[model samples]
Target: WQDYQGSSLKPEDFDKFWDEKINLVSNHQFEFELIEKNLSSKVVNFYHLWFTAIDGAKIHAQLIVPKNLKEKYPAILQFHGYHCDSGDWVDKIGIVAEGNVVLALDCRGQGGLSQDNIQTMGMTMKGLIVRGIDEGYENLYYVRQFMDLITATKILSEFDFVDETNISAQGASQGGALAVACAALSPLIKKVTATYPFLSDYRKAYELGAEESAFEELPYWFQFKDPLHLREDWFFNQLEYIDIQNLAPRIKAEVIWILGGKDTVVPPITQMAAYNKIQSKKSLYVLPEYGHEYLPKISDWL
Candidate 1:
C-alpha cells in the first residue's frame, strides 16, 4: 500500500466494530496551553492544544486560527506522515490563508509533544505500524489512532471558531490514511483529501514487496519477532482490524484521493483498493511520473 481486490478483506461488521470504538472513547475534553500566541506571523496565530484520547493518551495538535478571525470559519484537520510532526507555523498559515482554520496533529508517540506512554508487551518506540502488532488487533496502534482521529473531529467541531458544517481533513501517506479515517469515524467531516495514503491493504502490500518505505516494520517484525515465519498468516490476519480499505465504504465525506502512479510507498493497486470501495463523492488524480512524494498541491486544488 498490492493485489487487493475491490472487496478484499472488507469487514462485514465494520460499522458495528467502529461504532463500538467511537463509543468506547467517549466524552473526552480538550485542554490547551497557549504555547505561542503569535508563533510565526502576526497575521496568523497558533496554539498548542492537548486532549485526553480514548486510551487516555494525551494527544497534541497544532491549532492555527487566522488573526482577526471572527464568527465562524471552515477548519482543516491535518495528519502527518509516519514519524513526522504536525507542520510548522508557516504551513499552517498557508492553510489558514485559504480562509480556513487549521489543526495539525502529531501522531501519538511519533513526534511533537503528543504522548502514548501506555506500556504493553511487544511494544517498540522504533516503529508505528508494528508497535502493538503482536499484542492483539484491538491493542493495535491504529485502533487507538482511529479513536484519536474521531475524538479530534468532534472536539474540533465544538470549537467556537470552527464552522462545524465545513469540517474537513487532509494529508499524505500515513496522514492521508488518517485523514480518510477521521472522515470515516466522524460524521462531522464533510470533505477530505488523501494523497497516496498508507495503512491500507496490508496483506497485499506484504505480498507485492511494497513493505519498505511506509511498511518497513512489517518485514522487520517478521524477521525479528517471528523468525520462523510461524505467525505470518496470523500477523496479517490480525492487521485486518485496522486496515483502512475496510473502512472505505463507510466514508460519507466527499473525498479527493491523489495518487502518484509511480508510488511504491503506497502502491497504486492498494490505493485503488480503498478508492474502489468509496461509494460517496470521490475523485482520483494519478501522476504517472511522480512517486509517493509528489502530491498535487492542496491549496490550489481546493
Candidate 2:
C-alpha cells in the first residue's frame, strides 16, 4: 500500500466514503435461475445458473459438482477477468471432480450471456470502465458487478449441497477481486486465493501506465472521454466506490495471494495496494521470473 495511488491526503473518511457508496444499493432479491438443467461431463455433474443482480441485471454462471458427493461438500466460487466470460468446465473441472462444488459466474455485459441494465449519461464510451461515470458515482459499472458477487455469495451461502463452513473462492485478475469480495461481503467463506488480482488501486494503476490486457479500458477512457485529463481526478474519485483496496479490510477469509514481480497485466504495485490492506491471515507468493500469465502448478499449490 506504500506505493498505492491516492494513498496520500490522509484518506478523507475513505472507509466511510465506500460505506455510503455501496449502501445506496440494497442486496436486491436472491433469485437464482437455472438456465441449463443438465450439462454433460464425465467427472462432474454440470449445470448452468443465472441470477438477478441488485440493479436487476441478469448474471449467468456455470455450476459443476462431483458425483456421489456427501450431503454437504466444500464449494469453490470462481470469477473471471476484464471483458471475459465465465470460462469453461475444463479449466475448473479438476476441483469439482475432487468432490467440491465450483460455481463460476459470468459478469454482466462482458464476454458472456449476462446482461447489464446499464443506465448512464454524457458520452457512452466504448469501454465499460466509464460506462456510467458522468451520470453519478454510484452509477459506475463495477458497482453493479460487485453487487453481482454479493448476490451470488448470499445465494451460495444458502445452497443445500454447499458446506458453508468450508467454502472457499479462487480466481485470477478480475475474477480474483470478486473472490476476495465474496469473502468480504460474507463471513461464511474460510479461504480466499487469487493471482495478480485486478480492481485494485485504480488511480495508481493509471499513473504508472500499467493499463494493458487487463486495464485496457483505463487508457481508452482517458484518451476518448477526457483527453486533456481535465476530469481525471473526478473520474478516479467516482471509482473509489468499487476499488478493491477500499474493500480489502472487510474480508475475513485467510488469503493466499500469488503475485508476479515482473507481471504487468495488473501490475505488482496496484496488486499490493489491496494485498497490504488485508487484515487476515495471508501469504504473498512472489514469482519474480514470471510475467502476467498462467501460473505454473496452480493445482499443486492449492
Candidate 3:
C-alpha cells in the first residue's frame, strides 16, 4: 500500500470544472428551519434542522448546540455511512457536552427524511454511483450531494454562534468521502477525520474486484449499458469529475485518515491512493487487523 497509485486518473480540467461548480452554489441564499427537539438537556440543546439544497431538495440534519453558549463554538459537519441516515440525536450528546456544535446531515434520498428529487438519465436502481452516467458529470448523484455539502457548510458558518474558522468534518465510507470532499470545496473546514473513505480510484476498485461491495454498480452498469465494454473509457472519464482521490489534492484541512490493513471492501491500497495525494498536513492511523467495521476507539477520540 506504500507505493500504490490506483487506476483513477485526474482530468486536466479538474480545477476549472470544480471551480465553476462551486461558484454556482457558493453565494446562494440558504433557506433553513431549526425546530428544538424534545431530547434537549440543560447542558445541551438538540434540534431537527432542514436546509434547501441548490436543486430545491429538502436536506435534513440534527443540530446539537452547547447550552452554555459562547461568542462562538467550534462546529463539526458530520455525515453518515453509505445509504445510512445521520444517526439518532442522542448519539451526539456526548460531543455537545464537550462544548462543540454538530450538524449531522442525511444524504438526499437515503435512509433519512432528506429528499432526493433528482431524475437522471440512467439506471437509478441498485446503486447511486452510476445514476447519471448517461446524462453527464453534472447529473451524477455525488455531484449534487457535493453541492449540498457546500450549501450546508455555508449555512453552518453563517450562524452567529458558530466559529467558522474552527469548523471540522468527520465521516466513514460514503460519509468519509463527503467529509473530504466538503473540506476540499470549502475553506471553512480546518480539520477532517475520514475513515476508509469510498469513491476513490473507481477503476482500481473494479480491477481489484472490490466492486462486489460498495462499487458493485461499476460491473452492473457495464453489464447493462455497454455489454461489450465499449464505453469503458468514456464512463470512467466522467467518473473522474467526482472521484475522491482526484479531489484530495484540493483539500486544505489537516486530515487524519483511519485505515485497516486487512480491509477488502474499499481496499487499503485504494484508500492510500487518496491519502498519498493530500497536500496538507496528514496522518494515517492503521489498524492492522480491521476491515470496514466499527472502531470503538474512533468514537472515543472524536
Candidate 4:
C-alpha cells in the first residue's frame, strides 16, 4: 500500500473550497425546451437546459417529468455513465412508470443534447484529473462537474412539479459517483442508489490496475509531457476531493449500493472501502456473477 499522508485539509475546508470554486453563481438558470409533455397516464415534460458554472463555463442537460396530479411528488435525479447520453433514460420506463419525476443530466463533456455538445473548459474526461494536478480545489475537473450537478439539483428543487421532501439521486458507474457526490454535498436529497460506482478509493483502484478507464488519464497525460511528479501530486489532490470514500462521511441520505463482486472496471474491494466509510443509512447488494452489467434481479430492488 502507498504510504498515507493524511490530508492537510479538513472537511469544512474542502466544503468551503468547493462552495467557492463550485457555487459561484447564485441563480444559475436553465432554459427548458419541452420535447414531450403529458404522456399517456403520466404527465412528462422533456426539456433542454442551459446553465453557467462557477468558472464561467456554460453547461447543458435534459429534464423529464412524470405527470403527477398531486403537487410535489418525489423526484429522481438520474445521471448517466461516461460516453452515454441522457436518452438512456428511456430505458428507465419502470421508474417513470412508477410516477417519479426524473432528470437525466448529461455530464458536461459527454455527448448529449446539451447546448455545448461537449464538456466545458475543464470538464472533459481527459481534462478531469490531468489538468491542474498541482493546483488544489481552485481548478479541478470534478469540482466543476460536481458544482454543475449541485446546480442541476437546485434548479429541480425550484420546479413547481417537484416534491422537495422526497428528492432522490441515482446512477451507475461514473454516474453513480456523481450521485454519491451530489447527495453528499446537497442536503435536499433524501436517498441514493448507486450501481458499480466509479471514483472511489482511487489510489487503491490505481494500484490494483483493475480497469484501464479510470487510470487511462495518466498515460494520456504522459504522452503530452513528462508528468511523473505531476501525476503523484495529482493523485493526492484528487484524494482530497474526488475520492468517494472521503466524501462518504459527509453524505446525509440513505444509500442503496449495487456492487458487482467481480467488477473489473470498478473493483469490489475499493467500493467496499468506501461503503465502510459511509455514515448514513446504507445497504449493499452484491452480484457475484456480474462483472459490471445490470442484473435482472437488481432491477426488482430498484
Model 2 lDDT-worst window of ten = 1-10
Q: Report the lDDT of model 3 for residue 195.
A: 89
**Tens-digit lDDT track for model 3 on 37-82?**
8984768888899888878889889899988765799999999988
lDDT of 1 by residue, 1-302 (tens): 33346435545666688888777655545554546655568667878777876566788888888776568999899999987888666877776877898888888888777887545588474676766776677677788888878877878888788899999999999899999888877866899989889888877777777456577778778777888999887787777778888888888999998888777777777778888888899987777788978555644766
Full-model lDDT for every candidate: 0.78, 0.76, 0.86, 0.68
State the lDDT of candidate 2 residue by residue for 150-223, as single tens digits. Answer: 66766776788888788888888888888877777665689999878888777777777755656777778877
Say which prediction, candidate 3 or candidate 4, comes out ahead on lDDT.
Answer: 3
The order of the candidates by lDDT, greatest first, is: 3, 1, 2, 4
Between prediction 2 and prediction 4, which has the larger lDDT? 2
Global fold similarity of model 2 (TM-score): 0.89
Which candidate leads in TM-score? 3
Which wins on lDDT, candidate 2 or candidate 3? 3
User: Local error of candidate 2 at 247, Å?
Assistant: 0.7
When sorted by TM-score, best at the front, the candidate numbers are 3, 1, 2, 4
State how far residue 86 of model 3 sits from its true place (Å): 0.3
